[PDB]
């Protein structure tokens, strides 16, 4: 079990855990309660496994949207902070940590997309989406483009679609009220597609093409989150970050992710955990300790957010967050993503109309949400694989170690084209193996439990079979 009298905290490795440990020691000095801070591998999926068996950390830090499945799965303690304490965090951040009208976590930090522009190419960026066609003709005359952003993931195209009325589920979330083909969503997506029809954007621009274009000075604007600011400091491109453009006078509504701190329902230290988070972490000094270790971005605590907002990039993030739509914390969100990604791709590729793509998307999303359980997941690929080809055979490694928009991969005495394996990724139902130059080496599909079948980019058959042992 979880051990009484001590606090165990899990937080991801890309966070200021040493700063969090600092706050933990200040808490150990005033109370004698020891605070151990850990950053396990794949913590967001170890936690449900251990908490369901009465073990795990006392506190877990993760994005709010996963906590609704935890709370629906009764793996989280209900928190009841005083009204006086709730007033210190932005009111919308408490909405992100609400499930069935109960508070299930403490909001910590806040994240949302924002308009990123090149101040040299574009000193004063547009306030409206309507201005972007004219701005694009001006810039392409001079060999640049006005705007490029990932058109492949609904997360990036949703702020415009939802600007005039689109929404995932109505909000208590009603999984049978999907707002995907109302008038506002049709209008946003139609405007998006006509931008592509009128040759201001390319239907197949994805995350890397857009990021490369902006950092190489080829386009004046992009759309991304704080996670991408670091690669634009390598750029020496002088960029600003600002509010998203408005559509039909309505703000772009990006999805909002809220870093939150949940309490293990099996923890015998619930009250100790509430005191640490309320009285020690969620203070100007506590947040500063984590932030000096590793920046949080915008934060839910008003007082310290007023200090961080002196950075205009963080003020812009927070402003776009307060105008966006909180990412719904329900597992039925996976049906929203699947249906909407199909619809935006089909509408932008001309394979469907926005009225037909969105109509299908709302039918498929509503039906799948109402149903007990689509694409291939990087968890199902992570590991080491036997690789049969001809009479030849060998092994490849495909760790879930991020690398670009894919993952590191490695061949182990592999003949033929597999000797060039360097990265891997998943595309719906398809596993794709890549060069060190981004070229495609192979394409495979899950053909069963721990088994892949496909072919190289040059015709040779490939079969992947998992390595695994027994005690």
Residue numbers in the entry: -314 to -144, -140 to 61, 65 to 162
Give the original sentences from the paper that presented this experimental model:
U-Omp19 is a bacterial protease inhibitor from Brucella abortus that inhibits gastrointestinal and lysosomal proteases, enhancing the half-life and immunogenicity of co-delivered antigens. U-Omp19 is a novel adjuvant that is in preclinical development with various vaccine candidates. The latter domain behaves as an intrinsically disordered protein and retains the full protease inhibitor activity against pancreatic elastase, papain and pepsin.
In this work, a structural, biochemical, and functional characterization of U-Omp19 is presented. Dynamic features of U-Omp19 in solution by NMR and the crystal structure of its C-terminal domain are described. In silico studies have predicted that U-Omp19 is structurally related to the Inh domain, a characteristic β-barrel present in proteins belonging to the I38 family of bacterial protease inhibitors. To understand the mechanistic basis of U-Omp19 activities, in this work we performed a structural, biochemical, and functional characterization of it. These analyses shed light on the structure and function of key regions of the molecule involved in inhibition of proteases and adjuvant activity.
